[PDB]
């Protein structure tokens, strides 16, 4: 039970494949995000009305072409882990990597000529 | 009247000539201010006080200095990373998991 | 573009960990190659 244990470090519960079905049927799953290198794992976030409140569950998906209609029929909101904001930061990083070489060579030249003449050893 | 009129013309054109170069002279004056701060006696006093502070701090931090210079990577993090990385690759044999390492 | 977008899309501050890991391992690959060559 929940009443006979210490609260410890919020983590992801695990549903098998079936209580996920019943839960998304009863209208309780609220949002779903797909992940996995082969796109067959689900992280599902429930809604407050469910028995147990909002939790974050994990499900493993074995190919089933009825899934999408079931989800979209019951008001579930699918999601992808990318916002224009994130892509726009990746673009910024690519541009920095583009510029890093010429700046590196001009810094190298400047420090060569600095060490060589305009600030040498004293004698 | 005429010569002071020519002087008035040179004065107005001097106004224009002074203003057209104002960003350049602005950066120049800012640079002059910057490099003026760093040859006083006040800056020398600061440098010497910082020297004393560094000396005091170095006499109290010998164990941590040796730890971060000689021990952190070479004898704590590198062998752990190496063993974990080797065991990540290298199939679940015995010659490869235990005997060759 | 495609490399970085793919490692963003697949796997909070986790994208930053993955990107730093990517850049670090690439530079280390090039350096190890050069040193091992020059060691003959």
């Amino acid at each position: 039970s929940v009443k006979t244990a210490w609260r410890t470090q919020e983590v992801l519960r695990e549903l098998s494949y079936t209580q996920l079905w019943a839960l998304v049927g009863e209208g309780h799953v609220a949002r779903v995000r797909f992940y996995g290198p082969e796109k067959n794992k689900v992280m599902a976030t429930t809604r407050a009305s469910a028995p147990g409140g909002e939790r974050l569950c994990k499900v493993v998906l074995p190919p089933d072409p009825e899934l999408l209609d079931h989800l979209v029929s019951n008001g579930v909101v699918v999601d992808t882990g990318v916002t224009e904001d994130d892509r726009l930061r990746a673009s910024l990083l690519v541009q920095m990597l583009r510029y890093t070489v010429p700046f590196m060579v001009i810094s190298g030249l400047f420090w060569m000529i600095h060490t060589w003449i305009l600030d040498p050893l004293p004698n | 009247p005429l010569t002071r009129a020519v002087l008035a013309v040179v004065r107005v054109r001097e106004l224009l000539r002074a203003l057209l170069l104002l960003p350049f002279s602005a950066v120049g004056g800012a640079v002059a201010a910057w490099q003026g701060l760093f040859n006083s006696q006040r800056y020398e006093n600061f440098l010497m006080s910082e020297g004393e502070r560094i000396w005091a701090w170095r006499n109290r931090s010998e164990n941590e200095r040796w730890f971060w210079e000689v021990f952190a990577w070479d004898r704590l993090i590198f062998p752990i990373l190496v063993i974990v990385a080797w065991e990540y690759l290298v199939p679940n044999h015995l010659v490869w998991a235990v005997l060759a390492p | 573009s495609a490399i970085i977008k793919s490692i963003n899309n697949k796997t909070s501050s986790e994208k930053e960990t993955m990107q730093l890991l990517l850049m670090s391992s690439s530079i280390l690959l090039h350096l190890c190659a050069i040193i091992s060559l020059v060691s003959i």
């Binding site: 290198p37 082969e38 | 990540y88 690759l89 | 495609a2 490399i3 793919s6 490692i7 697949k10 796997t11 993955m18 890991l21 990517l22 391992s25 690439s26 690959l29």
Partner: peptide
Amino acid sequence: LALLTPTLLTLTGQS
């Protein structure tokens, strides 16, 4: 680079 290889193997179309 073997950690990211499942991720980077979508740029080729395989698993």
